[model samples]
Target: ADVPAGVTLAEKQTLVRNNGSEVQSLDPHKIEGVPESNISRDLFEGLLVSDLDGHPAPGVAESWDNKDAKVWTFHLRKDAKWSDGTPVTAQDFVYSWQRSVDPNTASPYASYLQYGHIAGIDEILEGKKPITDLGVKAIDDHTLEVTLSEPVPYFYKLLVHPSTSPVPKAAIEKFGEKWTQPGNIVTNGAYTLKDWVVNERIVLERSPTYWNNAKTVINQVTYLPIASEVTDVNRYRSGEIDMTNNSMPIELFQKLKKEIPDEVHVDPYLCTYYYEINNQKPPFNDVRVRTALKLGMDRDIIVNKVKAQGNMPAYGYTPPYTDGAKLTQPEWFGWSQEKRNEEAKKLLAEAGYTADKPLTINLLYNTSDLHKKLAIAASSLWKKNIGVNVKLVNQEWKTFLDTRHQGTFDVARAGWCADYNEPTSFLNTMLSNSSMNTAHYKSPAFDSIMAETLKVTDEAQRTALYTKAEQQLDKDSAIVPVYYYVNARLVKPWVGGYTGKDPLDNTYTRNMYIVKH
Candidate 1:
């Protein structure tokens, strides 16, 4: 590969990536956090893999073909092997898929399998059948076949997700949930777990047993789970870290761009930051109250003032890039901030709250400086523009996730990054039965439209259905869409092969080469 101009290849190549928070778990079947996904991507390989450009390329599976629209046969590489020298086989994937949707396993992303229309997975997820009824089968040691309940045009995209990765059945069976511990874990990807110190750092060393070990670039990758953006940026400046994939503080981002343009990276990211209202509660259950709360916010100020990055105000749940911009919002959502505030006051009065009897609610968010600032600005807006009193609640990452899952908060901060560059990645999470629907918003019309969209094969027709569904969801004000995200990050000039185009901002370290000064 040709090196970039003015940069030479490093003799000793190692990458230290900044993870804003510690990984919740390393187990592929149970992890729900984005940081966990970042860790898992280096430790495991699925049927297909994301290339440097975020396109699906061959991984363990060298090639695949679809016999019918619903059944796919994948030809696994003959040289694939686990870190322990055991041959990686098709049965490993079969076991992993079955275990994910098994109710007893309780994987948060297990619902994705059912949503993918994998045959028999719905019944297994519903506890109506056993794992054996799953639609995946190992045709032989080097081949696997999958049967989908329906023909999905983008089925291949689903295969690249970490949730579809093959696991070492022997290791999991012997070690059980502890299988992911540093010493017991066996992996088949470019890197293997070297050490994991809770709340501090996790390290990985290149795996000699990886199928194509010679092509794996970095010798080692270290991840620091620093929670504070200020601390993370300081570490980058001190050369304690090489790169960060998440956002830095807006003030720092501006300073870095002006002082050291070569060190800062900015790009449009496929993510949305929003707040989830607990619809199960009394005040939020009222539609007028929900509408007023959503309309009361000045999304423009939040993006331009609170977040000085090139972030866009989110008028709908899905990002503007979804489906090539076919999914859009109504003109009403484009009203000026002053008009929105005026209408918000009127709606609040209609909802039976006034200056004397102002509505009171609590806002919950995970512990982060960015989130704290956003909450403070939003709270001030509501109190000033809508005559509502807001209380702020903050919790650490793990506790915040648990509290959101248990529905203990009035309103909580939430964000979603597209899993497959599709609208369904955002909309599906709001389904009445979806585990990620922290808002607990339900609309039969919305659900029916999503179901209908899944059955349509024509791209244009499906996009139209998604547009209608997005409009309906917005009408209900299910969640307050705050702003679209821009990946404002810092990276040492030495790091190469990061294109930063993927909707998920996925990185493949194997394709990267470090430059020596």
Candidate 2:
């Protein structure tokens, strides 16, 4: 729908965005996808929140300090109020963290607490300790303290993720699982829930009780789940949306780049698009077959021809823009396409997958048109390079997430954006103990390297260790890196403070306001 007639843009400070996928949940502890996080960030602020530049800035907390980076303290804002006009206190954070890590919550991202190295997480996970034994505490009404098992330089950034968002304890107790319903949810961010029509739209209005409400210019926000890139672009053209998520019609990319260079945004993002192999599966269990698949990807053509959007061919999981990690390709990158194909054939033959006993494998991807094209390109490359017959399976967003977690696919499409801007944000998933390791990779050597990374605080030493971890992943052929993503998006000219600079590409509607053209 077009903007309402006879109403000035300044009269209504609403920012409608194409969320790309229907949000999974508004419950911060359970929300996982990028679209879900976007809505969650607007409805509920964490202790800290991403600024316009995607770096941490105060949300509920006004100031913070650390004792040797292990024992951290946060000073909450006295004025921080929930959407229902109740004060947001340090105890709120304590309860939120406890709820997130508690097994009863069953959050898919519960391991996030483990990632931050909270002092008692392992014991809690092992059922040896109660949720009360977790390391977060409310020193007073306005002060919160967190104890970590080790000094983590980037631990504070994790506070910005919705998984750590503080909830209204009383509201949850009153409503049970219905606490996140529009009328039941109580939030502390700049916006409050207005209405949610699942799969169609989720709307929010400005929160008068928000601590920074006076500074917030956007009066209302609406999210439309425009999963189709072409439809999203059409909506943007028709004035139904001000901005799009990280994709647009691929065939229109070059034309839009030339015609409306001002609107087309291509900026660095800290993410890698890759394929996760079920290393426990039959053919992939053989290291030779895994290595051959890694070699068979023609990332150059896949990115330029298949994707057409601006993307960097990737050879490692940690993207080039990561804070401390300097990514370098493996030696096979030196091999020409012809040489790579020859070697892939030899490796497949060695794994008893020749023309006489051909290899057939299932490749799984989600519902995006881009993902479909990429899957077709990869299957073609595998068939051409090593005589492997590839079967492609496309699933929707939520179903694909469940299927991938089930570990039933031979190989599945995967992408990871750093929750925080560190190498550990990417490399930590490779740890044998990491629950986020959907690939089910068990690498003792890789795990030890990551463990050693915690012992060193110096930037250079930590960076060098991260490099070795990436190398070990390459050595083991745990996954195939296809490309590094650029935040390919479109923004209206009237949208102010739209800096696509955050490697995370976070969108904070509070920092933006509509400007007269």
Candidate 3:
């Protein structure tokens, strides 16, 4: 009590946080889900880091420039070294980028380079060109040059994502899948992997070899992969964990907020919660059926009464904070609840689903009480309002990703947080070939608009084009857009420098310290 407010305890400095689920992988290029990103971002640093803000900050690539955004030059810091104290070079990035787009790697984020308009990426993914022929190049040990197929002003923003993070090539070649193991991996961020105890915990200790090690405060960070938010809340209350995940028991949100008001948080998170509708499948293949299901959901009820956590109802793909653009509210959004339901009934009937032939779907979600409640609410809504039956399916984190990837469920739970601060981060997922697009939505009009987006340099023009793309997505009714996310969590007051400021929620351990309680 005698210490200063921001002064940390002299005893020790460690931060224990919740990751919400077991990570799929520590490999940045291979892992796609939020669980993996939470761990991977701390273990690897890319060319840029958000540094807890919307604006991109330097990490490994100290300074970079591009005149027309078509050809870019990044000047790497000669002092930047790996966790093993080896020099990190431009060649590492070139090799990592090449490996990411190589079709044989089967990386889930294989389309990330293509999203940046990297030349020859399309050919490489399509199996027409060699991986070495891609546009990324290393001029020298400290000089990295990137050549884009088209000029994009927001390309720097994309570099903040770990999908583009460089990997240790020699380690990967020698260790293969074992390269990410505790004793084997060589990383380049503030924290390095110390211990990963599967479902229990994943530990990261401060790296002595980190370039910015002096700025690092928290000596160690622990991520608990507790799937249930209810359990996370209990752990937080018991002081077993210093922080909770972005989820809490829906029923207890108000109570906990009132009980420990200072600890609770509901901040704007750059993500959209939705259901993945398999557009390639039977009833979903029909536009009428798709539109009916899309309009059938009542986002207000789901966000307000069901969740009661500050969730913004999403009528379109992109959220309001992206790129300072006006969010597109689709045409059907103006219709009242009853009118939309009437239209839903009409479309379903025309598609041959009547009382005699009611539609049944399998709705899938990963293991979480929050997900179970949402699934129950959505299925109940579809049944009572739209005269459909849905069977709920639950799986653990790993299998759930695989199930969605394989298109084994009729409808599946899905969410996408922006990788960068642009509408393209949200809009690009529905593209016919997006590796992240598990819904299998294909549209020539949509693809054409996205293709045209890279060529435009003006913000107003790009915003207008993004509007049309969202309209195309709405017209096709490819997937359900339920609500925009708010990062609702509870953090102890002593967990200093931990704020849900970055919309992407890139909460690395480097900037955090423990204040004396």
Instruction: Estimate, for each residue in 1-517, the C-alpha lDDT of model 1 and write its tens digit.
Output: 2346777789988988898898878898998867888888889999988775566778889999874458888899999989998988999889999988888989988877765688888778999989998989999999999899887656776777888888888889899988999989999988999999998899999999998888777899999999889888888889889987576766778888999887787766778999898988888998888888899888888988887787888888889775334867666577887788788778888888878888998999998888999999999988888888999999999999989888898889889888776678788888899888888988999999988876776778888888888888888988888988878788888888776676567676677779887
Model 2: per-residue Cα lDDT over 435-474, one tens digit each: 7888888889999998888778687988898999999998
The window of 10 residues in a row where model 2 has the poorest summed lDDT is 1-10
TM-score of each: 0.78, 0.80, 0.76
Question: How many angstroms is residue 295 displaced in model 3 relative to the true structure, after the best TM-score fit?
Answer: 5.8
Write down the TM-score for model 1. Answer: 0.78
lDDT of 1 at 237: 86
Q: For model 2, how big is the CA root-mean-square deviation?
A: 5.5
Best by TM-score: 2
Kindly indicate the candidate among 1 and 3 with the higher TM-score.
1
lDDT of each: 0.84, 0.86, 0.85
Error of 3 at 100 (Å): 3.0
Collision pairs in model 3: none
Compute the lDDT for candidate 2. 0.86
Task: Kindly report which residue pairs in candidate 1 clash with one another.
Answer: none
lDDT of 3 at 398: 96
Better of 1 and 2 by lDDT: 2
Q: Model 3 residue 504 lDDT?
A: 75
